[PDB]
Amino acid sequence: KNIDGYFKIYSKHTPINLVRDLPQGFSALEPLVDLPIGINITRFQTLL
Amino acid sequence: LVKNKCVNFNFNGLTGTGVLTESNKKFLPFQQFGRDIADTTDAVRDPQ
């Protein structure tokens, strides 16, 4: 998310086993980063 | 750093005035402050 010059990231790396969908269970996301970039971002694309 | 003795302080721009002691308050890697039910700065972690 972008707020006040800050794009921001959070993350979790978790083991699961389900092929189909987002497992149902709760865990929450610490920040990794903050980037004081100042871009405006209206769109994005992943990469593979 | 001084302990057990009333001091003014600033940490990382967090300020306040207190008695800085040694506390077994397991913090988080990205965690900066502590706080408390009353919303009053409590524990801190020495930035250095």
Swiss-Prot record, chain B:
Attaches the virion to the cell membrane by interacting with host receptor, initiating the infection. The major receptor is host ACE2. When S2/S2' has been cleaved, binding to the receptor triggers direct fusion at the cell membrane. When S2/S2' has not been cleaved, binding to the receptor results in internalization of the virus by endocytosis using host TFRC and GRM2 and leading to fusion of the virion membrane with the host endosomal membrane. Alternatively, may use NRP1/NRP2 and integrin as entry receptors. Binds to host ACE2. RBD also interacts with the N-linked glycan on 'Asn-90' of ACE2. Cleavage of S generates a polybasic C-terminal sequence on S1 that binds to host Neuropilin-1 (NRP1) and Neuropilin-2 (NRP2) receptors. Interacts with host integrin alpha-5/beta-1 (ITGA5:ITGB1) and with ACE2 in complex with integrin alpha-5/beta-1 (ITGA5:ITGB1). May interact via cytoplasmic c-terminus with M protein. May interact (via N-terminus) with host bilirubin and biliverdin, thereby preventing antibody binding to the SARS-CoV-2 spike NTD via an allosteric mechanism. This is Spike protein S1. It comes from Severe acute respiratory syndrome coronavirus 2. The chain holds residues 533 to 580 of 1273 of the full protein.
